[PDB]
Design a protein around this ligand. Structure first.
Ligand code: 7DH
Ligand code: 7DH
Ligand code: 7DH
Ligand code: 7DH
Lengths: 60, 59, 60, 60, 62, 58
């Protein structure tokens, strides 16, 4: 099981470390899969690179 | 926040529903983001489509 | 330029053909890039495989 | 409907804003889906990270 | 090192097994990384789901 | 045929150029597909962005 998470840039290294752990755990729990097989990738998006309804998230 | 999870095929609909909920929650908690903005995509892989060390996981 | 579009299953082949064309055009226009270089991938999601707010889109 | 677009680095913020809008619109039109549900992600590639025919795009 | 490869549907299981092996090896060689860490995912695309120049590959291809 | 490869940051431009070529070749060989149709994307990951067993690769 491999998870890729796209998020807006701006968060601390600690928050991201937590995200990885908590998501990894949730995956292991939910699928009864061994925690050590779980991979997580975080991909940060620039605010000018993410659109909702055709408009940037950097003015919503 | 949009999460795509690749997993081996073979799990039940219930397990997957759970995966979606628990992961969505963990994201919301971890980033202090509203739960309703979180999207999750599950992508099932066939066992013949996933390699480790150059060999199928189906072996 | 390569675009991948995740959409809920259930649309017609014609709608998807249109999607491919219209998006490919929009990319070419926007970036002043040659239309023939543009690649588009459509990835259909099962309704039981897409979550919003932790709950399936096949409820909401 | 969630679109991810990989493009070469080098474009202006305005061009990208236009890309997001025009693509979002093309998606909404093509699938008769509400514009406000459409998400777009732009992922910029470094010129040394994109290959065609095994050769960098930064010698093309 | 994790590779995802999108290909048109239609190939045999053997061809895909080969693809996985040859690509994993090329990755290991190129990056001096241990072969056993390399992951590969193959994702098959339906011919109606892949566009070139705004037109399906299933009307520009077999 | 379009390949995206996620790798840890830290490698030289030459190594990556080699990765692109060798992988592109392997794909062409394996699928009997024309080399010039093969696309490769390299995506570098920061060490703080990649988790194994819930822990950073650092
Ligand atoms: C990951 C980004 C999602 C949002 O910001 C939102 O929809 O509110
Ligand atoms: C592409 C998925 C998003 C929706 O359909 C929506 O939330 O409206
Ligand atoms: C990987 C699919 C692409 C083609 O078929 C091509 O570019 O000719
Ligand atoms: C890319 C796959 C994982 C690793 O690099 C590792 O095993 O550290």
């Amino acid at each position: 099981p491999i998870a890729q998470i796209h998020i807006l840039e701006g968060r601390s290294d600690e928050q991201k470390e937590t995200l990885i752990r908590e998501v990894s755990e949730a995956i292991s729990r939910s699928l009864d899969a061994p925690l050590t097989s779980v991979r997580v990738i975080i991909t940060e998006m620039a605010k000018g690179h993410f659109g909702i309804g055709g408009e940037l998230a950097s003015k919503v």
